[PDB]
Amino acid sequence: EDRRFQETLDKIRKEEGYDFAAIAFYESNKPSSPIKWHYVSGNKNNRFKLIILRKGRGLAGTVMKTGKRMVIANVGLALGPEEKIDAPILLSESLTAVLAVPLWYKNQVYGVLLFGQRDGRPLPKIFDNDDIQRK
């Protein structure tokens, strides 16, 4: 699905030092549309395709709603096992740290770019909106 998104995601994930990256967007242009993880890079499995999110729910839904990045430097401490179910990509990809940033176009949030670490690897660097526009 537009190979440019996939290839760019793969390049950026690796250049930024991440074990995983994902982009979430609305599933369709219908008013009831949920949000889905449309593109992933460094994924262990394809279960991300089973995830259905709503505005305000999970990492992607919360960022879309608030327009604010979410940073979790250590998942095991910050959330523990029970809260992970609210942000199911953390379960399917065993993410131990995450940086989720809004994707803006003309002052609207259209998507969420998620960077994830596994195995306790720390986040290398936290990006701003300005930084992500310098993508």
Side-chain angles (χ1 to χ4, degrees), residues 37-50:
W37 300 101
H38 279 64
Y39 303 94
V40 295
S41 172
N43 62 303
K44 300 195 294 172
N45 57 73
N46 288 154
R47 302 199 287 284
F48 67 96
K49 305 179 186 177
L50 308 180

Side-chain angles (χ1 to χ4, degrees), residues 1 6 11 13-14 20 33 35 38 43 57 74 84 91 93 99 102 106-107 109 115 120:
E1 297 172 309
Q6 182 61 246
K11 184 209 268 252
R13 169 180 75 85
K14 293 182 250 195
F20 178 71
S33 174
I35 292 157
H38 279 64
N43 62 303
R57 320 311 322 153
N74 186 276
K84 290 162 110 176
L91 291 175
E93 291 297 330
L99 164 60
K106 307 299 184 186
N107 298 152
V109 184
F115 291 109

Side-chain angles (χ1 to χ4, degrees), residues 95-109:
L95 305 181
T96 58
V98 297
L99 164 60
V101 300
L103 293 181
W104 296 93
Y105 188 57
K106 307 299 184 186
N107 298 152
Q108 174 65 295
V109 184

